[PDB]
Amino acid sequence: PADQPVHNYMIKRLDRRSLNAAFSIAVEALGLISGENLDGTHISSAMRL
Amino acid sequence: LDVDATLAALRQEPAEVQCAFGAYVADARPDALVGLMQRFLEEWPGMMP
Amino acid sequence: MEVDIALPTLSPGDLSALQRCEGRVVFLETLRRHATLREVALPCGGDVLAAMAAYRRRFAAVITRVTPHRMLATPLGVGGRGQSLVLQNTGPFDLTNGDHVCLVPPLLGDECLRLTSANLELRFPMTLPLAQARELTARVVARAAETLQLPPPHRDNAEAATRSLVLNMIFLLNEGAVILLSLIPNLLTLGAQDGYANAVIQLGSATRELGQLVRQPPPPLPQDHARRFCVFEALEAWIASASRLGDTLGTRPVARVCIFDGPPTVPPGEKAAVVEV
Amino acid sequence: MEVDIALPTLSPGDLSALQRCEGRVVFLETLRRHATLREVALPCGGDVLAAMAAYRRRFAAVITRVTPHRMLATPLGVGGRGQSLVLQNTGPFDLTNGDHVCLVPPLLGDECLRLTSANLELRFPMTLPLAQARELTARVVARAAETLRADVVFSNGRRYQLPPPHRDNAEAATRSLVLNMIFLLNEGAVILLSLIPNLLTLGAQDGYANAVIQLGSATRELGQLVRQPPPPLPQDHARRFCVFEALEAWIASASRLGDTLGTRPVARVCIFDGPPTVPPGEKAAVVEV
């Protein structure tokens, strides 16, 4: 028997996955960068660096 | 020694017995054993279709 | 003529499933041009015998297109005998080329399209090859005759089927039937001289168990046997009655399948072309 | 929708011999636009029942013009508007205008177009009006029955002779048919009497008539008129016999034998502007059904 030309339609679905990192921050060392308790002396800026 | 389940699994379809010669036991009245064999040998072909 | 089945409003869910019913057949009652879905609606599974009985009183119609609103159809046979069309094989078997098809009610239930909006259901019957629909009808009728993958009968209309059977079986007994019955041993003695003849007589033939139990004298000569010969009209009655026996119990063949290009065998759940007879 | 047929080089003269067969129907296999003569062929000594069963597993087709290269055929089943087509009658008796013709294997003394050149044989089926087709088979089977332990048919004047049996080299051509036809009737009678034993002992003019007349009416049925048969053996015995299994088998076999017996109008003569009746061998005009 003869034949017909055959078509087709496909549907591929997306996927979701979220990779996440987390980095902590210090507590004691919170002023040096800051100026709430930063002080006009010279050692505070050194510790700040 | 767990047969309770399997034993339930076979009693769903009904089964027709074909031979009942060695699956049945009965008590006999006190009837003078020598005659009991005579009484039983007339029914033995009757229990083996 | 093309029946216009109108549809009420539907939830967007079941309309999409109904859209996939492009080749199944329905059963109207009146052949007006316009009709509503609520009309053609068969209850849930049960009474394969009563349902089979209710397929010869109504006529069939296959559908071709489902718009969101209306529903085209096709009155199957009222005036067409070459009207080509297509219908999806919804039976458990396959249907090769050339063999006729027949409508048989569904099996086991659980094959029913349920519409939530309309609160109705439809039971599209399966399509089997004639050669097996006959055998299924035979099986169902034989089982019905015992209450004087199997659903139990109701005894309500099983008696009607047994009546339809015993009528045709009684009217087969005629005065030449006894003559033909007289030669049962004269036929058995032939069935043991040739192989083919032996194969024509089955094993559970219920008559081989007669030719060993009963002897019968030569039959009495008919009233005025010299003028007419009885065996011939006996055989003619038999031919005519057996030609339309299964029809009286099951269902007539409705179309023969023919394909030009696609492969011959078509698997289930696949749409296949057909001409109707 | 037309179909041709490839044709091998037969010979001179023999092609002209085939050229006398322009209405005879041949059974194809599948409606492909190219077939070959080697495929449409049957041994012209063959069992009538087997070929008759095979007539349903195939498609009919009518030979139109034939040329040294090929031969054209037209199918019958699939149709549109019912185009007419010439059809050469080949039955034993003529057929009148205004009936429905049927197709039956060469039940009587066979005719087969033997082609010695291409080493094959052709077997064309007869064309009978429905009424006489319902009768001729029964006639032959009944004559065979009388033989196992008169030959006249009438159709538009002529009394036909029904050529004597076994004259052909194939006396056993119809043996399978008569066997399978007699046996099933015997079976049906035996089963009826087995379910209803007291049937024949009723009033030969009233009791039996009372039973049959109140059977067509409603539910009475003497309650369970069919008596309860005695229960069977332990179903491994060498004598077990469940009557209902035999009933089922008989329903099946009888329905099959009924279905594969033609008795279905395939075509209908609608002659126009021609003699009123066509004799055997003269072509005619027919419309499909």
SS (HEC) of C81-135: CCCCEEEECCCCCCECCCCEEEEECCCCCCCCEEECCCCEEECCCEEEEHHHHHH
Alpha helix positions (H), chain C? 12-18, 48-53, 130-144, 158-170, 175-182, 184-191, 195-200, 230-243, 245-249
Instruction: Please give the Cα distance from C144 to C165 (Å, whole number).
Output: 11
- Nearest to residue C134, comparing CAs of C276, C239, C277, C251? C251
Which value, to the nearest 10 degrees, does the dihedral of the CA atoms of residues C204, C180, D226, C133 take? Answer: 60
- The b/e string for C223-252 (b: 16+ C-beta within 10 A; e otherwise) is eeeeeebbbbbbbbbbbebbbebbbebbbb
Residue by residue, what is the 3-state secondary structure of D171-205? Answer: HHHCHHHHHHHHHHHHHHHHHHHHHCHHHCCCCCC
Rounded to an integer, what distance in angstroms lies between the CA atom of residue D218 and that of residue D221?
Answer: 8
Give the minimum alpha-carbon distance from B37 to chain D in angstroms, rounded to a whole number. Answer: 26
**What is the b/e burial string over B8-46, where b = at least 16 CB atoms within 10 angstroms of the residue's CB?**
eeeeeeeeeeeeeeeeeeeeeeeeeeeeeeeeeeeeeee
A with B: touching (≥3 Cβ pairs within 8 Å): no
The span from the CA of C267 to the CA of C265, in Å, is 7
> In sequence order, what are the beta bridge partners of D57?
none
Q: Is C261 on the interface with A (CB under 8 A)?
A: yes
The owner of tokens 């196992």 is D148
Which two tokens mark D215? 């059977």
What is the token pair recorded at D21? Answer: 């067969």
Q: Distance between CA atoms of D127 and D87, rounded to whole angstroms?
A: 9
Query: Using CB atoms, which chains have 3+ pairs under 8 A with A?
Result: C, D
Query: Rounded to whole angstroms, how far apart are CA atoms D9 and D67?
Result: 11
- Phi, psi (5° rounding) for residue A33? -60, -25
Tell if the CB–CB gap between B16 and D235 is shorter than 8 Å.
yes
Contacts of D267 (CB under 8 A, 6+ apart): D76, D87, D100, D101, D286, D287, D288, D289
Q: What is the resolution of this structure in A?
A: 4.5
C208 φ/ψ angles, rounded to the nearest 5 degrees: -60, -30
Contacts by D198-205, CB closer than 8 A, 24 or more apart: D198/D227, D199/C170
- Identify the residue whose tokens are 């297509």: C86
| Closest Cα in chain C, distance from residue D219 (Å) | 8
Between chain A and chain C, the number of residue pairs with CB atoms below 8 A apart is: 12
- Give the position of tokens 């930063």: A38
Q: Are C25 and C60 in contact (CB under 8 A)?
A: yes
Residues C238, D56, D277: CA angle, nearest 5 degrees: 75
Give per-residue burial for C16-55: e unless 16+ CB within 10 Å, then b.
eebeebebbbbbbeeeeeebebeebebeebebbbbbbbeb
Instruction: Quote the strand ranges of chain B, DSSP E.
Output: none
CA of B16 vs chain D CAs: smallest distance (Å):
7
Contacts of C161 (CB under 8 A, 6+ apart): C49, C53, C141, C144, C145, C249
Calpha distance D46→D170 (Å, rounded): 8
Q: How far apart are CA B49 and CA A24, in angstroms?
A: 89
* Alpha-carbon separation of residue C217 from C174, C178, C214 (angstroms): 18, 11, 10
For chain D, the maximum distance between any two Cα atoms, rounded to a whole number of angstroms, is 76
The answer to whether B30 contacts chain D (CB < 8 Å) is no
Structure tokens at A1: 């028997």
Chains B and D touch (3+ CB pairs under 8 A): yes
CB contact under 8 A, C146 and D244: yes
Query: Distance (Å, rounded) from C-alpha C96 to C-alpha C264?
Result: 6
| DSSP single-letter state for residue D241 | -
Dist. CA D185–CA D183, nearest whole Å:
6
User: If you search the block for the tokens 């009424």, which residue do you land on?
Assistant: D131
Q: Nearest residue on chain D to A2, judged by CA atoms?
A: D32
Instruction: Name which of D282, D269, D278, D273 is nearest D84 in CA terms.
Output: D269
What residue type is assigned to position C144 of the chain? Answer: A
C184-191 and D130-148 helices cross at what angle (nearest 10)? 80
DSSP assigned state of B47: G
Q: Which amino acid is at C20?
A: R
Cβ neighbors of B27 (< 8 A, separation 6 or more) are none
List chain C residues with CB under 8 Å of A1.
Answer: 259-264
Q: CA C184, C189, C192, C197: dihedral to nearest 10 degrees?
A: -50
Sheet with C25-27, side-by-side order of all strands: C25-27, C60-62, C74-75
Distance in Å, alpha carbon of D136 to nearest chain A alpha carbon:
39
With residue D216 as reference, give the H or E element that holds it. helix D207-216
**Phi and psi of C107, rounded to 5°?**
-120, 135
Inter-CA distances, C219 with B28, C212, C222, C272, Å = 57, 19, 9, 56
Contact C83, C252 (CB under 8 A): no
Q: In this complex, is the C-beta atom of D34 within 8 Å of any C-beta atom belonging to chain A?
A: no
In the beta sheet, which residues pair with residue C26? C61
Separation in Å, CA C64 to CA B5, B18, D140, D242: 52, 57, 49, 48
**Region for C247 from its dihedrals, namely left if φ exceeds 0, alpha if ψ lies in -120 to 50, beta otherwise:** alpha
Closest C-alpha to C106, from C90, C126, C87: C126
Token readout for D66 is: 């034939």
Neighbouring residues of C169: CB distance < 8 A, sequence distance ≥ 6? D188, D191, D192
CB pairs under 8 A between A and D: 3
**Local structure of C28: helix, strand or coil:** coil
Q: The tokens 């279709």 sit on which residue?
A: B49
Q: Measuring CA to CA, which residue among D217, D235, D215 is closest to residue D226? A: D215
For chain C, the distance separating the N- and C-terminal CA atoms, rounded to the nearest angstrom, is 17
Axis-axis angle for helices C175-182, C230-243 (nearest 10): 100
Residues with Cβ within 8 Å of D210's Cβ and at least 6 positions away in sequence, in order, are D202, D203
Residues in A closer than 8 angstroms to D32, CB to CB, are 1-2
The strand pair at D34-36 and D3-6 is best described as: parallel
Strand order through the sheet with C271-276: C85-88, C271-276, C255-256, C100-104, C126-129
The strand pairing partners of D59, in sequence order, are D28
CA of C17 to nearest chain D CA: how many angstroms apart? Answer: 33
Angle among Cα C24, C25, C31 to the nearest 5 degrees reads 145
**D250 and D238 in contact (C-beta within 8 Å)?**
no
**Reduced to 3 states, what is the DSSP secondary structure of residue D60?**
strand
Contact indicator for D14, D80 with CB cutoff of 8 Å: no
Helices (H), D6-109: 14-18, 48-54
Those chains having 3 or more beta-carbon pairs within 8 angstroms of chain C are A, D
For residue D75, what is the enclosing H or E element? strand D70-75
Set of chain A residues whose Cβ sits within 8 Å of the Cβ of C259: 1
Q: Find the distance separating the first CA and the last CA of chain B, reported in whole Å.
A: 34
Three-class SS state of C162: helix
Query: How big, in percent rounded to 5, are the helix, strand and coil portions of chain B?
Result: 35, 0, 65
Tokens of D84: 């007419």
Radius of gyration of chain B (CA): 17
Total residue count of chain A as it appears in this document: 49
Distance, in Å, from the CA atom of C126 to the CA atom of D69, rounded to the nearest integer, reads 46
In whole angstroms, give the CA distance from residue C184 to residue D192. Answer: 16
Q: Which of D189, D132, D161 is nearest to C234 (CA)?
A: D189
Instruction: Return the closest-CA partner of residue D261 out of C170, C246, A29, B1.
Output: C246
Question: D128 forms bridges with which residues in the sheet?
Answer: D102
**How is residue D211 written in tokens?**
């039973």
